[PDB]
């Protein structure tokens, strides 16, 4: 039973354990490439870390477009039919 | 037989004199009553047949076919009354009359004591049949070929036999039959006596009219064609082989090869059929190829198996056409891959699909299996090598039977099809009236084993 | 169909996943995953695009030799052990229109809300069709991307079967 | 070690040399293919999403397929004829000299 | 790092897994063969 | 209940129990429960039913078919005599089938009854089954589905001629 | 539910 | 929470 | 006799009642699964009374209650053979099914068709008891094909999933190829003997029994998934876990072996058939044990474990020890069913994860599942005095000292070592090490239905072999004299397997790259047989069918 | 490689509808609106009576008075007879075996 | 047209609800109540269909008689050879 806040907490949690991110510039709206200065190779690993976290695969076509934590939260919430 | 002929005739006045909206209620109710009285024919004796008069008789072979024939008419009425709803009253009554006249010819055909009387009624059944399929169908060479290579030679041979023997009464032929000696003229008498029945079975190589006929026919036409009309060929061969011995010893070889190989071919074709009604039609060719083999090797076990196969196939194949018609009446297409995952939308109708498929692949102890098993045992004595062909056919049959079930009932439903309304009581009752008697016959199989029992 | 970048990133993910299948243990995978990243970081700034394509081609040939014959698959991914497991349980919403009224009367509140959605669908259809006409160049669309709703009160064109799709665990 | 394709094992798309050799002509072909697919997708969706549609969306591609699809030889028959004839000749000959064992054979 | 810490930090070896319950099973066995050998004298 | 001569059973020999243990036999206590709970109420119900059958006693009979001339005595093409000979032959054919069935059931019952010693203790039943199956095979095997008294007689004459020819050869 | 799930921690046992 | 389960009509 | 026969039949009738009351007759949908579980529980008790009577005095019965059909000189009656094999197997099957049904009440709890699932499981059981009590070939054929159809319906339970339907049709395909041999045997016995009854077949005792026994062997090959017709059993893992537990223990898979056991009076005297069944069993047990060494799906490993054990039973048939093959059937049912339920316990707690590479660290997190898994693994590997040792150990001694094919003997001993390796593999990657599963920990096994069902099978996997072997009457002369190196071969090769497996499993933790050898790929892809055959033969048949 | 502003906006609008649709699948408190050791022993007692005792009465009646009244329908394997045994039917005593060699 | 739209209680037999209900009744009564239930009972109690039970009793009479007189249970010859006259 996932919830929107529960998903948001876990998405940020995983990013706060990534050494390439400063957990002081990290908000739900931080852009991985424009605000946090990460690579596209880095973004692939972030998406892989989310797949591990929640136990399901995010296809490559959809993965490229998730560039902020909120976009990840929305994708996971939409996939699992979470509405609050 | 007059206790069955006359009430069947009275169905015509009943249909025409009925109130406008009661034609389906009256004809169905009273044809079921006739079917009920048909059980009186099961007064069969161990030694003698039931010989009513100089024209009609009933042995253990014609009795189950008679009961199947009279059971089918009420079922055909239920299957038809939905797609004929928009037809005008007079055309509704003309369609019902065609079905009644077909039953009238059929019951007399299965009980005719004289072979020339059999031949005349045997050909009269085509008049209502062709009218039904053409006038109410969905959308030449075979008529010409069949009459040229089947009907006409049979007439000449029967007339010739009557001149020589002096009679064509079947009881008389049982005592005056003489052996058929080798000669070129007897080879043509043998072929003339059998080709009309082989075309109607149909024999592999002469079978392509059947898938075409089923694709064009309305549901009632397919039901009677698959259940009873094909069995006229089997019944005719079971009778006329009495007077063809011993020449059948070698004349059967080419037709046995066609059937044994045809079994595997038509079963294999069923795997690649894209149209449900064609798939069932080819399935019937495969099943009937077993009946031809059984008739031709003529052993006590093969005749019991042949009789059971003809009855079992009649119910099973008719039920499958009704199941395919229930889908067609919703999606208006015969294509098998169009509507998938129907078990999700129509749960009970999926149960009928399963039961029909299980009988089609001859699950024991269904009479489909009993008949098929008896033929397999008899052909093994004929030649041990045949078991390979029979065994492979059992494998392929299970494949296409379950492929049909899996394609239409399982998987994901088709998104854009949104007119799959719940099954009507009419359709569920129609399916159970095929499968319930079929499964009940497992309790007392002896009544569909024929006179060799 | 896919840019050179998209092919390099799709190989990176695929290579890492197959490496995970070999290593199994997380510390071992972490060590070799960093070596793999160092190989992708060696030629990150390759300018000559003929050289870069040759590097990608060799990378994919090396991957084919080194791939796991039985890689890990997420259970609900295509080819996984739970893939399409629940499809038999997804019933389309239009099936509710055929319920007997005695079946409908057990859920009055639900079927009242369902009418509101059906109304919302009917009243929006014409505007959705008009929007797609006036935004579609002559000759039809060149891509499958759909537009958003541009006014207030409009719904994004062709939303019904996305919004009302079955749940992933419908029972 | 080079991959060798077969009828039942197609060449992986990543090992196909063509997928890296891309030209304006190849991109143009891909764009035309996407335009054809998008046009069909739009035509299907306008019927699929129509609130007032109840029935089947007939696919002419499916109709074309079934129409086209619904539109050795004697060697097996000869081969089996000689297998069974040869077997039945041997068995018949043995029965006539009493060699074949049919001690308990009374069902046929 | 959670996979190597606090609760998951120590896991038995394969031999340790096999010998689960051996200490109490062997203690019971010694009692039982003591109880049986005593009755032999009786 | 049935003719013990047609379906014989050797005398039964159950050994008396000789318990060499002190634990009670649970199967003896389950037998008494079975007799008390299952058998006795079942017996009472049957005794009530049999009392009703006694009040109304009526009889049925085994049909006796008089013998009629064989097909050997029928003139060619004489259907009236052929019909009666043919029908009689069919009745005898059906009876011979049930004679083989009786002998097969004797054999099968002996196999189960003798247990591990059946190969030696069922020799008589096997011998009788072997002989009757031979006689049945001689009468009826290879006639075909359209069998008749005529075809059976033709088979007999072929066999008789061969035997006569073999007698001369010796 | 007797056993609440735990995040990144060893589970609760009875 | 309790959710509606969409099913085909079972009445017939 | 009157209590023996009445209770034998009430065992079967009791099982059909929950099916009969499905037609609206005080049917409580409330807890239909509990009702069906209770019926299995009471059927087990009533079946223990005839078994006790047989253990006591060796009482045996044939009940031919109903005369169904007479085809000239062939009477067909509904006849039940309440003999040695029926009396011992029925209680074992009912005991295992009782646990699988109670396990299923927890495992299939959320399934909306829970009632239909228990109906199918019950039908699966009924059709299997028809098989084992059948006294004539036609009645056996009813059960034979009945279990096949129920496998199709249960393998394809999740019918929206294309791979489930493909696996279900695959099972029918391979089993129907075996049924060619079954009908071949039926045709031969009818023609040459004049019967389908087991009593008359054994009384006539034909000597030229090559053809009927080849047919029976072919039927066993398909049903018990011997080499050639084996791929369908691993694919049957598409079904829900309770189906695999029942399919692989007390139903379906052992019916093929059971058929050959029933015809041991014929195979005893046919050394040609013994050679064929010996060689077929030896290649099966070795080949599938090799496939299990590299599988990563926990259910596939146990599926290949079953095929390997089925191969050992086939070997036991080929050395003329039908009673030891039967004992292995009974013992194997206890711990093979338990292993599947332990795997389902793991799979459920990791949200349907089945790949052992994503398990680990479960030893302390699931103490009861761990205990049952270790007990089950040790029983399977022939740990002295657990249930598996009382059949497997005797089978190896019997094979070692028999006049036998030497290569078949060798392949069988190697497969015994492989049993230890893939057993070690499950324990190592599932229970040991560190957790490799996702971060939201939902591990929970504290459900009484789960504990109780596994517990009863754990007790079975400890004492059932000892209890059964000490009650069955001797029907052979066991070989008890042999050199020390033949007496202890099974123990030694099993220990070497553990030593070898631990070395290899500990090498995986090294920080060294790993490249695939041709042998590794051969094992992983099941010797390529499914890949080549399930593409070639479908292509050849389908492509010719259209044209 | 992110969403375009158009793509972002459409997803947001579909997200809002989807979440409202999912919330509307929740049942209200009144739905569904339906139309109008002792216990452990009772079920086992009733179940034993209806599913064991009644079937065994029917089966025992069936076998005793219809099946065993016909020949060879229930065939027993004859009891084993060992040396020293006494036969109930006749009272015959089976002589013991010879005397064994020492072993 | 969908029959359920106007008659949610439809049995599928007719648009007219009264005729529809009557069509259902005759099919179910004459179909199941009569033909299938009474027909099955009628078939279950057929008087010795094709003489099989008489043949069994007759065989018992002959087996008992022939074994009591040391006569063969069955003879290879169907017809008495005294009545047969061979050729040549
Ligand atoms: C005089 C007598 C007059 C004739 C009367 C005959 C009886 C009529 C039955 C009336 C039934 C009325 C009723 O309430 O239906 C209840 C029953 C359950 O109601 P439901 O809960 O709403 O579910 C029905 C759904 O269709 C869902 O149903 P389902 O999916 O659960 O059922 C599917 C099942 C259907 O099969 C069954 O019916 C279960 C019983 C199998 C036996 O399919 C199978 O299991 C086929 C494989 C069976 C294995 C074969 C084993 C070998 C044969 C053994 C023979 C014994 C030799 C000794 O409804 C039906 O299934 C209708 C089918 C009726 C045909 C019965 C055929 C028997 C087979
Ligand atoms: C459970 C045990 C079952 C049982 O009670 O046994 C009773 C019997 C079988 O047991 P039985 O025959 O051994 O015993 C009956 C009663 N005594 C003991 C007196 C003999 O069941 C039946 O015989 C009924 C089967 C009849 C099925 C056919 C009837 C349907 C007719 C419909 C006509 C339309 C279909 C057309 C088909 C064309 C071919 C005919
Ligand atoms: C062309 C075949 C014509 C056959 C024919 O004309 O032969 C005549 C023969 C009877 O005439 P008959 O006077 O008895 O001649 C002496 C016979 N030994 O004829 C007969 O004895 C029987 C004639 C049977 C009728 C055959 C009709 C022709 C059909 C043959 C093909 C049928 C299969 C379709 C191809
Ligand atoms: C190879 C075989 C394959 C078979 C495939 C077909 C499978 C069908 C399902 C199996 C059915 C098994 C049950 C059989 C019993 C039913 C039939 C029967 O009982 O027959 C009547 C019986 C005497 O049997 P009888 O008629 O003499 O046998 C010869 C028949 N030709 O006399 C009686 O029945 C009297 C019994 C009295 C009952 C007392 C209890 C009251 C009734 C309670 C229920 C209501």
Rounded CA separation K74/I35 (Å): 56
Q: What is the DSSP letter of D6?
A: B
Integer angstrom CA distances of residue C35 from C31, C41, I202, I511? 7, 10, 71, 12
Task: Take residue C76 and report the two structure tokens written for it.
Answer: 């609900």
Give the containing element (helix H, strand E) for I372: helix I367-380
Collect all residues with Cβ–Cβ distance below 8 Å to C6 and sequence separation of at least 6: A60, A64
Q: Do the Cβ atoms of C95 and B345 come within 8 Å?
A: yes
Q: Are strands G6-7 and I440-441 parallel, antiparallel or unpaired?
A: antiparallel
Question: Across the strands, what pairs with D9?
Answer: D6
Residue nearest to atom 5 of ligand 4 (CA): B365
Q: Are strands J74-76 and I74-82 parallel, antiparallel or unpaired?
A: unpaired
Among I88, I108, I93, CA closest to I43? I93
Q: Chains that contact F by 3+ CB pairs under 8 Å?
A: B, D, I, J, K
User: Which residue does chain J place closest to I66, by CA atoms?
Assistant: J67
Q: Closest approach of chain I CAs to the CA of D100, in angstroms? A: 11
- The answer to whether the CB of I289 falls within 8 A of the CB of I418 is yes
Rounded CA separation B350/B353 (Å): 5
Residue nearest to atom 8 of ligand 4 (CA): B443
Rounded CA separation F1/D108 (Å): 34
| Helices H / strands E in chain B, number of each | 21, 2
Among J50, B197, F5, CA closest to I13? J50
Q: Which residues line ligand 1 (CB under 6 A)?
A: B 347-348, 351, 354, 436, 439-440; I 19, 22-24, 116, 119, 123, 127, 130, 142, 146, 149; K 36-37, 40
Rounded CA separation B295/B281 (Å): 21
Judged by a CB distance cut-off of 8 A, whether residue F138 touches chain J is no
Question: Across the strands, what pairs with B51?
Answer: B57
Please name the residue that has the structure tokens 């169908």: B137
* H-state helical runs in B112-247: 115-124, 126-135, 141-146, 152-165, 170-176, 184-200, 209-216, 219-224, 230-240
Cα–ligand 3 centroid distance for I264 (angstroms): 59
Q: Looking at A9, A22, A39, A52, which residue is catalytic?
A: A39
Q: Do the Cβ atoms of C101 and K8 come within 8 Å?
A: yes
User: Which residue does chain C place closest to D45, by CA atoms?
Assistant: C158
Rounded to 5°, angle at Cα C31 from C27 and C33? 110
Collect all residues with Cβ–Cβ distance below 8 Å to E32 and sequence separation of at least 6: none
Cα–ligand 3 centroid distance for F76 (angstroms): 27
Rounded to 5°, angle at Cα B16 from B15 and B21? 70
DSSP string, I178-200: HHHHHHHHHHHHHHHSS--BHHH
**Which ligand number lies closest to the CA of residue B373?**
4
F44-51: long-range contacts, CB 8 A cutoff, minimum separation 24:
F45/J61, F46/J61, F46/J64, F46/J65
Rounded CA separation F112/F119 (Å): 11
Rounded CA separation I379/B278 (Å): 55
Give the containing element (helix H, strand E) for B229: none
Rounded CA separation B74/B24 (Å): 10
Judged by a CB distance cut-off of 8 A, whether residue J22 touches chain C is yes
Question: Across the strands, what pairs with B50?
Answer: B58
Question: Within 10 Å of residue H10's Cβ, how many Cβ atoms?
Answer: 11
Residues of B in contact with I141 (CB under 8 A): 364
Residue nearest to atom 23 of ligand 4 (CA): J66
Q: Peptide bond preceding F101: is omega within 30 degrees of 0, i.e. cis?
A: no
Rounded CA separation B414/B437 (Å): 34
Among B206, B210, B209, CA closest to B194? B206
Q: Are strands I74-82 and I440-441 parallel, antiparallel or unpaired?
A: unpaired
Please name the residue that has the structure tokens 């056991």: I261
Residues of I in contact with D105 (CB under 8 A): 191-192, 194
Q: What is the DSSP letter of I63?
A: E
Among B314, B317, B285, CA closest to B404? B317
Q: Closest approach of chain C CAs to the CA of J4, in angstroms? A: 11
Burial of C97 (0-12, 13-18, 19+ CB in 10 A): middle
Judged by a CB distance cut-off of 8 A, whether residue I180 touches chain B is yes
Atom of ligand 4 nearest to the CA of J61: 39
Residue nearest to atom 38 of ligand 2 (CA): B68
Cα–ligand 3 centroid distance for K76 (angstroms): 41
Judged by a CB distance cut-off of 8 A, whether residue I200 touches chain J is no
Rounded CA separation D45/C144 (Å): 11
Question: Within 10 Å of residue D4's Cβ, how many Cβ atoms?
Answer: 7
Among B329, B208, B278, CA closest to D67? B278
Give the containing element (helix H, strand E) for C68: none
Burial of B164 (0-12, 13-18, 19+ CB in 10 A): exposed
Q: Do the Cβ atoms of C95 and B413 come within 8 Å?
A: no
Task: Take residue I312 and report the two structure tokens written for it.
Answer: 């050992």
Q: Do the Cβ atoms of D55 and B418 come within 8 Å?
A: yes
Residue numbers followed by a gap, chain H, C–N over 2.5 Å? none
Among B278, B409, B427, CA closest to B345? B409
Residue nearest to atom 49 of ligand 1 (CA): I146
Helix axes B89-111, B62-80, angle to 10 degrees: 170
Ligand 2 within 6 A of CB of B66: no
Residue nearest to atom 29 of ligand 2 (CA): K40
Please name the residue that has the structure tokens 């029926």: I86
Q: In chain K, what is the straight-line distance between the N-terminal and C-terminal CA atoms, in Å? A: 84
For chain H, the residue count is 12
Rounded CA separation B291/B303 (Å): 9
Q: What is the DSSP letter of I70?
A: E
Rounded CA separation B420/B413 (Å): 10
Q: Closest approach of chain D CAs to the CA of F95, in angstroms? A: 15
Q: What does the radius of gyration of chain I's CA atoms come to, in whole angstroms?
A: 23
Residue nearest to atom 21 of ligand 4 (CA): I66
Give the containing element (helix H, strand E) for B50: strand B50-51
Helix axes I406-431, I271-292, angle to 10 degrees: 30
Task: Take residue B193 and report the two structure tokens written for it.
Answer: 């006596």
Q: Which of residues 407-426 of B touch C (CB under 8 A)?
A: 410-413, 415, 418, 420-422
- The answer to whether the CB of I190 falls within 8 A of the CB of I199 is no
Q: Do the Cβ atoms of I535 and D8 come within 8 Å?
A: yes
- The answer to whether the CB of B48 falls within 8 A of the CB of B40 is no
PDB experimental method: cryo-EM
Q: Closest approach of chain C CAs to the CA of J25, in angstroms? A: 7
User: 3-state SS string over chain B?
Assistant: CHHHHHHHHHHHHHHHHCCHHHHHHHHHHHHHHHHHHHHHHHCCCCCCCEECCCCEEECCCHHHHHHHHHHHHHHHHHHHCCCCCCCCHHHHHHHHHHHHHHHHHHHHHHHECEHHHHHHHHHHCHHHHHHHHHHCCCCCHHHHHHHHHHHHHHHHHHHHHHHHHCCCEHHHHHHHCCCCCCCHHHHHHHHHHHHHHHHHCCCCCCCCHHHHHHHHCCHHHHHHHHHHHHHHHHHHHHHHHHHCCCCHHHHHHHHHHHHHHHHHHHHHHHHCCCEHHHHHHHHHHHHHHHHHHHHHHCCHHHHHHHHHHHHHHHHHHHHHHHHHHHHHHHHCCCECCCCCCHHHHCHHHHHHHHHHHHHHCCCCCCHHHHHHHHHHHHHHHHCCCHHHHHHHHHHHHHHHHHHHHHHHHCCCCCCCCCCCCCCCHHHHHHHHHHHHHHHHCCCCHHHHCCCCC
Q: What is the DSSP letter of I424?
A: H
Judged by a CB distance cut-off of 8 A, whether residue B242 touches chain F is yes
How many C-alpha atoms does I424 have within 13 Å on its Cβ side?
23
Please name the residue that has the structure tokens 């090869």: B257
A39 is catalytic: yes
Rounded CA separation B70/B3 (Å): 13
Q: Closest approach of chain I CAs to the CA of C170, in angstroms? A: 10
User: Which residue does chain D place closest to I533, by CA atoms?
Assistant: D8
Integer angstrom CA distances of residue I95 from A38, I240, I247, I250, I255? 61, 20, 15, 10, 17
Q: Which residues line ligand 4 (CB under 6 A)?
A: B 365, 442-443; I 66-68, 76, 78, 138-139; J 58, 61-62, 66
**Which ligand number lies closest to the CA of residue B155?**
3
Q: What is the DSSP letter of C146?
A: P
Question: Within 10 Å of residue F83's Cβ, how many Cβ atoms?
Answer: 16
Instruction: Select the residue from C94, C95, C96, C98 to test the K interface by mutation, using most K Cβ atoms within 10 A.
Output: C98
Instruction: Select the residue from D49, D59, D70 to test the B interface by mutation, using most B Cβ atoms within 10 A.
Output: D70
């Amino acid at each position: 039973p996932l919830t929107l806040e529960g998903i948001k907490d876990r998405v940020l949690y995983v990013l706060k354990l990534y050494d390439k991110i400063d957990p002081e510039k990290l908000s739900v709206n931080s852009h991985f490439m424009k605000d946090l200065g990460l690579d596209s190779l880095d973004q692939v690993e972030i998406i892989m870390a989310m797949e591990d976290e929640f136990g399901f695969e995010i296809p490559d076509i959809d993965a490229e477009k998730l560039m902020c934590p909120q976009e990840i939260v929305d994708y996971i919430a939409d996939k699992k039919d979470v509405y609050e | 037989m007059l206790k069955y002929i006359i009430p069947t005739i009275m169905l015509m006045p009943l249909t025409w004199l009925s109130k406008n909206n009661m034609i389906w209620v009256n004809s169905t109710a009273h044809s079921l009553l006739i079917s009920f009285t048909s059980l009186l024919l099961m007064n069969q004796f161990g030694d003698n047949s039931l010989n009513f008069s100089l024209l009609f008789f009933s042995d253990s072979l014609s009795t189950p076919l008679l009961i199947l024939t009279m059971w089918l008419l009420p079922l055909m009425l239920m299957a038809s009354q939905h797609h004929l709803s928009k037809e005008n009253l007079t055309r509704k009554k003309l369609f019902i009359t065609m079905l009644i006249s077909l039953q009238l010819f059929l019951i007399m055909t299965f009980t005719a004591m004289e072979l020339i009387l059999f031949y005349i009624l045997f050909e009269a059944t085509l008049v209502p049949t062709l009218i039904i399929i053409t006038r109410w169908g969905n959308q030449g060479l075979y008529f010409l070929f069949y009459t040229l290579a089947g009907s006409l030679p049979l007439l000449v041979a029967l007339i010739y036999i009557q001149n020589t023997v002096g009679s064509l009464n079947f009881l008389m032929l049982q005592y005056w039959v003489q052996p058929v000696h080798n000669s070129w003229s007897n080879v043509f008498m043998w072929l003339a006596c059998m080709m009309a029945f082989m075309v109607k079975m149909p024999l592999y190589g002469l079978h392509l009219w059947l898938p075409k006929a089923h694709v064009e026919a309305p549901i009632a036409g397919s039901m009677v064609l698959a259940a009873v009309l094909l069995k006229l060929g089997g019944y005719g061969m079971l009778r006329i082989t009495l007077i063809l011995n011993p020449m059948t010893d070698f004349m059967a070889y080419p037709f046995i090869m066609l059937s044994l190989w045809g079994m595997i071919m038509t079963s294999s074709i069923c795997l690649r059929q894209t149209d449900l009604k064609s798939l069932i039609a080819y399935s019937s060719v495969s099943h009937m190829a077993l009946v031809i083999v059984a008739i031709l090797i003529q052993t006590p076990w093969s005749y019991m198996g042949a009789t059971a196969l003809m009855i079992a196939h009649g119910l099973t194949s008719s039920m499958l056409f009704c199941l395919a018609n229930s889908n067609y009446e919703r999606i208006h297409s015969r294509t098998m891959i169009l509507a998938r995952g129907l078990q999700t939308l129509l749960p009970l109708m999926a149960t009928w699909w399963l039961l029909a498929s299980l009988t089609n692949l001859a699950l024991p102890p269904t009479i489909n299996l009993i008949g098929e098993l008896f033929v397999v045992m008899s052909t093994f004595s004929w030649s041990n090598i045949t078991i390979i062909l029979m065994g492979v056919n059992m494998v392929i049959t299970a494949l296409y039977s379950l492929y049909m079930l899996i394609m239409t009932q399982r998987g994901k439903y088709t998104y854009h099809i949104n007119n799959i309304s719940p099954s009507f009581t009419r359709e569920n009752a129609l399916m159970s009236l095929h499968i319930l008697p079929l499964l009940l016959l497992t309790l007392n199989p002896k009544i569909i084993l024929g006179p060799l029992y | 169909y896919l840019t050179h970048q998209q092919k390099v990133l799709r190989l990176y993910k695929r290579a890492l996943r197959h490496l995970e299948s070999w290593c199994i243990h997380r510390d071992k995978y972490r060590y070799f995953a960093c070596l793999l990243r160092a190989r992708f970081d060696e030629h990150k700034n390759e300018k000559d695009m003929v050289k870069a394509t040759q590097l990608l081609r060799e990378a994919e040939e090396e991957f084919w030799h080194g791939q796991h014959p039985q890689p890990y698959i997420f259970p609900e991914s295509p080819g996984g052990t739970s893939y399409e497991r629940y499809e038999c349980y997804k019933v389309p919403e239009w099936c509710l229109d055929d319920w007997h009224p005695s079946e409908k009367a057990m859920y009055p509140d639900y079927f009242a809300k369902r009418e509101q959605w059906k109304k919302l669908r009917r009243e929006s259809w014409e505007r959705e069709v008009k929007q797609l006409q006036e935004e579609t160049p002559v000759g039809g669309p060149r891509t499958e991307a759909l537009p958003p709703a541009r006014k207030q009160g409009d719904l994004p064109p062709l939303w019904w079967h996305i919004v009302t799709r079955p749940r992933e665990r419908p029972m | 070690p080079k991959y060798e394709a077969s009828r039942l094992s197609s060449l992986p798309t990543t090992l196909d040399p063509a997928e890296y050799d891309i030209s304006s002509e190849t991109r143009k072909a891909q764009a035309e293919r996407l335009a054809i697919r998008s046009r069909l997708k739009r035509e299907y969706q306008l019927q699929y999403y129509d609130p007032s549609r109840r029935g089947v969306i007939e696919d002419p591609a499916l109709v074309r397929w079934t129409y086209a699809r619904s539109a050795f030889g004697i060697g097996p028959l000869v081969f089996w004829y000689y297998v069974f004839k040869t077997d039945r000749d041997r068995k018949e000959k043995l029965i006539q000299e009493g060699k074949l064992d049919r001690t308990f054979n009374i069902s046929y | 790092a959670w996979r190597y810490m606090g609760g998951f930090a120590n896991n038995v070896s394969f031999v340790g897994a096999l010998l689960k319950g051996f200490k109490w099973g062997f203690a019971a066995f010694v009692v039982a063969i003591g109880a049986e050998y005593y009755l032999e004298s009786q | 209940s049935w003719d013990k001569d047609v379906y014989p059973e050797p005398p039964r020999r159950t050994p008396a129990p000789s318990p060499q243990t002190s634990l009670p036999n649970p199967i003896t206590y389950l037998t008494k429960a079975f007799d008390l709970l299952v058998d006795r109420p079942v017996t009472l119900v049957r005794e009530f039913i049999e009392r009703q059958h006694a009040k109304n006693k009526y009889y049925y009979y085994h049909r006796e078919f008089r013998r009629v001339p064989d097909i050997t005595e029928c003139q060619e093409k004489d259907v009236l005599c052929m019909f009666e000979a043919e029908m009689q032959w069919r009745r005898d054919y059906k009876v011979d089938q049930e004679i083989v069935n009786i002998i097969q059931e004797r054999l099968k019952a002996c196999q189960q009854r003798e247990g591990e010693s059946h190969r030696q203790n069922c020799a008589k039943e096997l011998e009788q089954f072997t002989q009757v199956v031979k006689a049945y095979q001689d009468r009826y095997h290879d006639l075909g589905a359209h069998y008749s008294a005529r075809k059976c007689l033709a088979k007999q004459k072929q066999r008789m001629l061969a035997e006569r020819k073999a007698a001369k050869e010796a | 539910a007797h056993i609440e799930p735990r995040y990144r921690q060893f589970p609760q046992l009875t | 929470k309790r959710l509606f389960i969409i099913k085909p009509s079972g009445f017939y | 006799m009157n209590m023996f026969s009445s209770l034998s039949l009430v065992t079967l009738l009791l099982l059909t009642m929950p099916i009969m009351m499905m037609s609206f007759n005080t049917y409580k949908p409330s807890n239909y699964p509990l009702y069906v579980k209770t019926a299995i529980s009471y059927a087990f008790i009533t079946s223990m009374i005839p078994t006790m009577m047989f253990i006591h005095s060796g009482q045996e019965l044939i009940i031919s209650n109903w005369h169904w059909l007479t085809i000239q000189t062939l009477k067909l009656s509904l006849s039940f053979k309440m003999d040695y094999f029926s009396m011992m197997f029925i209680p074992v099957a009912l005991f295992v099914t009782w646990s699988i049904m109670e396990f299923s009440m927890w495992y299939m709890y959320s399934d909306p068709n829970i009632n239909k699932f228990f109906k199918y499981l019950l039908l699966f059981l009924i059709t299997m008891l028809i098989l084992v009590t059948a006294n004539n070939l036609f009645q056996l054929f009813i059960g034979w094909e009945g279990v096949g159809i129920m496998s199709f319906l249960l393998i394809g339970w999740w019918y929206g999933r294309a791979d489930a339907n493909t696996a279900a049709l695959q099972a029918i395909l391979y089993n129907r190829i075996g049924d060619i041999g079954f009908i071949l045997a039926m045709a031969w016995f009818l023609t040459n003997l004049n019967t389908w009854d087991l009593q008359q077949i054994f009384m006539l005792n034909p000597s030229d029994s090559n053809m009927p026994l080849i047919g029976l062997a072919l039927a066993a090959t398909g049903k018990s998934a011997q080499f050639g017709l084996h791929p369908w059993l691993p694919s049957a893992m598409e079904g829900p876990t309770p189906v695999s537990a029942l399919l692989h223990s007390s139903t379906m898979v052992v019916a093929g072996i059971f058929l050959l056991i029933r015809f041991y009076p014929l195979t005893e005297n046919n050394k040609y058939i013994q050679s064929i069944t010996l060689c077929l069993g030896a290649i099966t047990t070795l080949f599938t044990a090799m496939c299990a060494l590299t599988q990563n799906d926990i259910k596939k490993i146990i599926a290949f474990s079953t095929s390997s054990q089925l191969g050992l039973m086939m070997v036991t048939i080929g050395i003329n020890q039908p009673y030891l093959a039967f004992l292995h059937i009974c013992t194997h049912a206890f711990f093979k069913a338990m292993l599947f339920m332990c795997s389902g316990s793991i799979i459920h707690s990791l949200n349907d994860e089945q790949d052992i590479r994503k398990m680990g660290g479960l030893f302390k997190a699931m103490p009861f599942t761990t205990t049952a898994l270790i007990v089950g693994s040790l029983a399977l590997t022939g740990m002295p005095f657990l249930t598996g040792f009382y059949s497997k150990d005797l089978i190896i001694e019997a094979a070692n000292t028999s006049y036998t094919n030497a290569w078949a003997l060798l392949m069988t001993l190697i497969a015994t070592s492989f049993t230890a390796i893939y057993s070690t593999r499950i324990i190592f990657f599932a229970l040991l090490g560190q957790p490799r599963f996702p971060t939201l920990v939902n591990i929970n096994e504290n459900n009484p239905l789960l504990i109780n069902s596994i517990k009863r099978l754990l007790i079975g996997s400890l004492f059932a072999g000892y209890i059964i072997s000490n009650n069955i009457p001797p029907t052979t002369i066991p070989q008890m004299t042999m050199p020390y190196y033949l007496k202890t071969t099974a123990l030694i090769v099993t220990i070497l397997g553990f030593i070898l497996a631990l070395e290899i499993s500990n090498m995986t933790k090294n920080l060294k790259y790993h490249y695939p050898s041709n042998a590794f790929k051969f094992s992983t892809l099941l010797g390529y047989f499914p890949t080549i055959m399930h593409r070639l033969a479908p292509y050849m048949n389908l492509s010719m069918s259209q044209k | 490689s992110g969403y375009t502003p158009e793509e972002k906006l459409r997803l947001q609008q579909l997200r809002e509808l989807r979440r409202r649709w999912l919330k509307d699948q929740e049942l209200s408190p009144r739905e569904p609106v339906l139309p109008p050791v002792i216990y452990k022993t009772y079920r086992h007692s009733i179940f034993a009576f209806t599913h064991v005792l009644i079937p065994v009465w029917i089966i025992h009646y069936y076998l005793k008075y219809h099946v065993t009244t016909k020949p060879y329908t229930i065939v027993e394997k004859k009891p084993r007879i060992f040396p020293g045994d006494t036969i109930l039917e006749t009272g015959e005593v089976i002589p013991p075996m010879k005397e064994f060699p020492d072993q | 047209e969908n029959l359920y739209e106007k008659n949610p209680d439809s049995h599928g037999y007719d648009k007219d609800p009264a005729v529809d209900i009557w069509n259902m009744r005759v099919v179910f009564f004459f179909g199941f109540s009569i033909v299938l239930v009474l027909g099955s009972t009628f078939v279950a109690y057929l008087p010795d269909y094709r003489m099989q039970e008489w043949a069994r009793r007759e065989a018992e009479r002959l087996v008992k008689y022939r074994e009591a007189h040391g006569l063969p249970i069955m003879e290879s010859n169907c017809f008495d050879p005294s009545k047969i006259q061979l050729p040549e």
